[PDB]
A paper describes a structure:
Epstein–Barr virus (EBV), a member of the Gammaherpesviridae, encodes the Bcl-2 homolog BHRF1, a potent inhibitor of Bcl-2-mediated apoptosis. EBV BHRF1 is a Bcl-2 homolog that potently inhibits host intrinsic apoptosis via direct inactivation of cellular proapoptotic Bcl-2 proteins Bak and Bim and selectively interacts with a subset of proapoptotic proteins (Bid, Puma, and Bax) to regulate apoptosis. Despite sharing very weak sequence identity with its cellular counterparts Bcl-2 (21.7%), Bcl-xL (17.9%), Bcl-w (18.4%), Mcl-1 (9.6%), Bfl-1/A1 (17.8%), and Bcl-B (21.5%), BHRF1 adopts the conserved alpha helical Bcl-2 fold comprising eight α-helices, with helices α2–α5 forming the canonical hydrophobic ligand-binding groove which provides the interaction site for the BH3-motif peptide.
For the BHRF1–Bid BH3 complex, a clear and continuous electron density map was observed for BHRF1 residues 3–155 and BidBH3 motif residues 78–107. The four canonical BH3 motif-defining residues from Bid, I86, L90, V93, and M97, engage four hydrophobic pockets of the canonical BHRF1 ligand-binding groove with an additional hydrophobic pocket occupied by a fifth hydrophobic residue, I83. Furthermore, these hydrophobic interactions are supplemented with two ionic interactions (salt bridges) between D95Bid and R100BHRF1, the hallmark of the pro-survival Bcl-2 interaction between a conserved arginine in the BH1 motif and aspartate of the BH3 motif, which is found in almost all pro-survival Bcl-2–BH3 complexes and R88Bid and E89BHRF1, as well as two hydrogen bonding interactions between D98Bid and G99BHRF1, and between R84Bid and E89BHRF1. In contrast to Bcl-xL–Bid BH3 and the previously determined structures of BHRF1–Bim and Bak BH3 motif complexes, Bid BH3 engages a fifth hydrophobic pocket of BHRF1. Residue I83Bid occupies a pocket formed by BHRF1 residues F72, T76, and V79, all residues highly conserved or conservatively substituted in BHRF1 variants. The use of a fifth hydrophobic pocket has previously been observed in several other viral Bcl-2–Bid BH3 complexes such as KsBcl-2 and the poxvirus variola virus F1L.
Numbering used by the authors:
A (entry chain G): 76 to 106
B (entry chain A): 2 to 35, 37 to 156
Write the structure that this text describes.
């Protein structure tokens, strides 16, 4: 690890979690 | 027919006017000239400014850690912005919640760069460019969904 590309990738997935957490609520409400 | 580049820049201009008022950063002024027909005061911008701020507050500890870590390790901030984006929206399928999270993370990035008398200009410049050109990857999937304005107005 401890690579400049591993640290960028690790940040991208942290944000994807935040996003997915939010997106869990939209589908079930629409239909 | 506003694009992501425009609504994002407007949000940062809107967010800069709300925090301490003061002069708008020359980089942001120039980006509004090099374009931005959407006023920072426009209703759609006011709606999104509230929403994205709530996202930042709810994920405050994560948005600071990830950003503080991002800025202190990158050597090409304009390129690493597109790297993060492609991981979220190209290596995976777009989501409405993933788009809001990205937009909120970029608005939080500017907040830490807008009104600081110690942040170098070349740092602010590459960061503003990294966001706006990397956020173009959402225009496609979002016009399919009806556009930013329609997404929030319900």
């Amino acid at each position: 690890s401890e690579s400049q590309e591993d640290i960028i990738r690790n940040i991208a997935r942290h944000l994807a979690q935040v996003g997915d957490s939010m997106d869990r609520s939209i589908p079930p409400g629409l239909v | 027919a506003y694009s992501t580049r425009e609504i994002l820049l407007a949000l940062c201009i809107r967010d800069s006017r709300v925090h301490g008022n003061g002069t708008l950063h020359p980089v942001l002024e120039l980006a509004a000239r090099e374009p931005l027909r959407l006023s920072p005061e426009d209703t759609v911008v006011l709606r999104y400014h509230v929403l994205l701020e709530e996202i930042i507050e709810r994920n405050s500890e994560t948005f600071t850690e990830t950003w503080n870590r991002f800025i202190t390790h990158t050597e090409h901030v304009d390129l690493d912005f597109n790297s993060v984006f492609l991981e979220i929206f190209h290596r995976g399928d777009p989501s409405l919640g993933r788009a809001l999270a990205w937009m909120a993370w970029c608005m939080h990035a500017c907040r830490t760069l807008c009104c600081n008398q110690s942040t170098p200009y070349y740092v602010v410049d590459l960061s503003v460019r990294g966001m706006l050109e990397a956020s173009e990857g959402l225009d496609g999937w979002i016009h399919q969904q009806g556009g930013w304005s329609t997404l929030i107005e319900d």
